[PDB]
Design a protein around this nucleic acid. Structure first.
Ligand SMILES: OC[C@H]1O[C@H](O[C@H]2[C@H](O)[C@@H](O)[C@@H](O)O[C@@H]2CO)[C@H](O)[C@@H](O)[C@@H]1O
Ligand SMILES: OC[C@H]1O[C@H](O[C@H]2[C@H](O)[C@@H](O)[C@@H](O)O[C@@H]2CO)[C@H](O)[C@@H](O)[C@@H]1O
Lengths: 436, 437
DNA sequence: TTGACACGTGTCAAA
DNA sequence: TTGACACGTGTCAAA
């Protein structure tokens, strides 16, 4: 729970949380406010469960796509930076964090997936997904593999699903059609089918996750991985000479990654809303602030103009933004959570062979549009069945007390029902078959 | 994931030296040509029973010995058949830790006990008792620091204090553990948990403090003390902290009694590489060079291998570990241990957060720790009885609806069919179901 | 031990 | 949209 005078921050465990803790420390020495940074597991899921009751951190860091739902639920404090501060950031990073006309978080950095490759094993990375199988057969003879990346999170597979035409929610007339899903069209199918065939032909393992892929690449066992800018520092500490480049094409079309905007939202339940703005605006979103974080784990293309003109000169950032130009900014609508869950189930289920690609994506389609039942809807159902049982119970209480039926000492209401049937001229067999 | 012939896949917890173990796998691969993959998935001790039931899961699984009896009872593990010669290379009591129903069910690797870890520069003289920790915290807070921080989300770390004044899991008597004699609700257990909850109430600790929050604060020099196992020393070493490892503090004048774990390696009963796994474990891992490679990554504690433990026992930190281990007890490996752990975890978390009182949390924990898990057949008995109860009712109402002629609306529920039946039989049924003649 | 009935959410469908 | 009945596990009790 939040309490006046201190600041607690939640950020994902793959971001530079020590670097950010360094920013809170300098914030503590200047103002005397202690700042604790924490990287709990599944924080994008825990926050909406505890913020409702008033708990959660002061600030929550995540990509912009989850913030619309948070705001829809009233969990986020409206952000109102002065004009002078708004002009410090690229306008399009502000667009990413505006929901229903209001700013619901501070944008931090732009993230896109790129192809990361081992220049020593692979001086010339492939330009196409199609040549990866042959490349893997060649490397497998030397004890290596072509490509490993996280298959448990649809974020990493979506660039390939969207290459040939797959899309989450169609954008038309200036809006997102919560009810036009493109996870089951020919383009999406072709992409997921190629990925599953990679597994069938034993070029990838269905159970490969984030840490397995990162280990294999950082140890030099795989020639390529797909990851974001946060991964670079761990490769830097390794003996691998890597390059960051454009993702491969599929059927001649570019891979289209979903582009994330790492953002910091303020808990509407927080008693330190002003202290959090002072920290975010005048400590984190500064050259020295982002630098301290970026030096920990690279941020990507930061939203702060003054510091991005520097980072934009890193060829790895230029490749990140090359991939981001071919991708799309993720929607922030509340249904993005349902989209991500459904597509996650589809990828995992087709990769494992539990479902065909057709069946997996067919179900993902309906799931990604499925509306979550409201609290009142659940309560209507719960009360109806309560009522249904209470009415029956009172009828059988009456039959038992006044029926004077020949019932055993202990018997269920089916037996009472039977004695009521017999009384009313009915015959009831052992299995319930009933007639006059 | 399924195990494939000619390959080895290993599961080991993320806080152990899985990079060192991979190096051992790399040697195995070089001498025999068998690839070895080390993974450290989350919640592996829960995932293994789920996947292994159908033949999935890794070839080898590393965990403390307390989970393995349940795996064996479920048929998930291969019987370990080390020649008498090889068994004599490990301390007998480590073999006891992995013996279940007379059979050995895993290779013991290392002995783990929690110790008190303190910052020599902030705290040259560590406290001897839990009681003096609140005063110590008051001093340090005036310097911007705290006295003690440790994982409150896993009961393993709080159990030494709960056991100190008398708490216990399952009573040992007549050469076996009594599954119906649980001691998480006696006066000793209540005193221990009450003192911990008082630390939180008095702002000396945070209820939400987990493993990484505690590790980060100690390793960054914000708290003078932590409680942890040997695996944690290497991260402290790389930090700027000058630390010692010593005996846990006493509570009510009695020693803290940590539950002692034996990190152990079981072989998946479904593995077609049982021989390769035995070769890797017996002749590559459980060797001086093998455990050295793992121990270099993250300290194993006091290894089961006699030859190499004579080297590790020279380390004062191991001497402190074993001092605490002598004061604790080897964990049971009985299947009921998972239920004991879940119960105590819920009690500790609910008490520390104020969601439940100590007495009420521990009362529920006692019932839960002793509760027998219903068998598959018990569940199936219940499921089929209710299926049959509904099927009989549905046939009756199907017959009432077909031959009744009760004059019912197009759509109505069986309560209305019942009501019609009642009036046909000379009854009157009110709106809420009130029924009489 | 077995077993009556409660419980809230799932499946299927009419509208 | 609301709503019938299914569904398996929980609560409570008799023995
Ligand atoms: O996999 C679905 C997941 O994708 C995105 O999450 C990214 C996140 O943006 C990155 O910062 C990084 O941590 O990797 C994540 C993928 O594991 C979405 O932002 C997220 O909402 C979604 O669940
Ligand atoms: O907290 C309950 C938990 O305790 C033990 O787990 C230890 C494990 O023994 C150590 O090796 C280390 O990893 O820390 C763990 C606690 O986080 C039991 O072995 C385990 O079964 C039990 O659930």
């Amino acid at each position: 729970k939040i309490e006046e005078g201190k600041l607690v921050i939640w950020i994902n465990g793959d971001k530079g949380y020590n670097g950010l803790a360094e920013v809170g420390k300098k914030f503590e020495k200047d103002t005397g406010i202690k700042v604790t940074v924490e990287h709990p597991d599944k924080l994008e899921e825990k926050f909406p469960q505890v913020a409702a009751t008033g708990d959660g951190p002061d600030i929550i860091f995540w990509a912009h796509d989850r913030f619309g739902g948070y705001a829809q639920s009233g969990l986020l404090a409206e952000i109102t930076p002065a004009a002078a501060f708004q002009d410090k950031l690229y306008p399009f990073t502000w667009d990413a964090v505006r929901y229903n006309g209001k700013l619901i978080a501070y944008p931090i950095a732009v993230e896109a997936l790129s192809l990361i490759y081992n220049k020593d094993l692979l001086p010339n990375p492939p330009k196409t997904w199609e040549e990866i199988p042959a490349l893997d057969k060649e490397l497998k003879a030397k004890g290596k593999s072509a490509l490993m990346f996280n298959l448990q999170e649809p974020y990493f597979t979506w660039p390939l699903i969207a290459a040939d035409g797959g899309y989450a929610f169609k954008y038309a007339a200036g809006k997102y059609d919560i009810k036009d899903v493109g996870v089951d069209n020919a383009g999406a199918k072709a992409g997921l089918t190629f990925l599953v065939d990679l597994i069938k032909n034993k070029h990838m393992n269905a159970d490969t996750d984030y840490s397995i892929a990162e280990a294999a690449f950082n140890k030099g066992e795989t020639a390529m991985t797909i990851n974001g800018p946060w991964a670079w520092s761990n490769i830097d500490t390794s003996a691998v000479n890597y390059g960051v480049t454009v993702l491969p094409t599929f059927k001649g079309q570019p891979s289209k990654p979903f582009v994330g905007v790492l953002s910091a939202g303020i808990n509407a339940a927080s008693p330190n809303k002003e202290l959090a703005k002072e920290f975010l605006e005048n400590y984190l979103l500064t050259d020295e602030g982002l630098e301290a974080v970026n030096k920990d784990k690279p941020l990507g293309a930061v939203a702060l103009k003054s510091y991005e003109e520097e980072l934009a000169k890193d060829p790895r950032i230029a490749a990140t933004m090359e991939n981001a130009q071919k991708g799309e900014i993720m929607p922030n609508i509340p249904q993005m959570s349902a989209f991500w869950y459904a597509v996650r189930t589809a990828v995992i289920n087709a990769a494992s062979g539990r479902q065909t690609v057709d069946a997996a994506l067919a179900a993902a389609q309906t799931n990604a549009a499925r509306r979550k039942p409201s609290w009142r809807e659940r309560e209507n159902n719960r009360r109806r069945e309560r009522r249904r049982r209470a009415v029956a119970a009172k009828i059988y209480t009456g039959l038992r007390a006044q029926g004077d039926y020949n019932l055993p000492k202990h018997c269920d209401n089916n037996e009472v029902l039977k004695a009521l049937c017999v009384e009313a001229g009915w015959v009831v067999e052992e299995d319930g078959t009933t007639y006059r």
